[PDB]
Design a protein around this ligand. Sequence first.
Ligand code: YQO
Ligand code: ZN
Length: 100
Amino acid sequence: SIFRCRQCGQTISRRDWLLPDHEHVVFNPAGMIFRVWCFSLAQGLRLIGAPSGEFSWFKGYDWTIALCGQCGSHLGWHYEGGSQPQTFFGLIKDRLAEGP
Ligand SMILES: O=C1CC[C@]2(CC(c3ccc(Cl)cc3Cl)=NO2)C(=O)N1
Ligand SMILES: [Zn+2]
């Protein structure tokens, strides 16, 4: 029901906050594959830098790197500047732990 940072246990999100498919399998320009779950809402992150559109997986959205606010582990990206919705989070599924 709750998603925590796999590395340190920081509270991040909830199954209830998943945003549809909620799963997207993508590759960055360094050829790294991420299984990304989209969330309407997340907490306990630190958004680093200003947004960029470069190589955005989601048409009309700019991304900022989302670290775990506690341990600094890269948990995914915040997406902004789009429409329906304006903002959402793309979190790397295998860097989260699910439970009570
Ligand atoms: O939506 C996204 C999130 C982030 C991103 C873009 C990206 C990147 C951008 C510029 C440079 Cl110079 C180097 C990198 Cl390694 N890495 O992952 C991606 O591909 N799509
Ligand atoms: Zn963490």
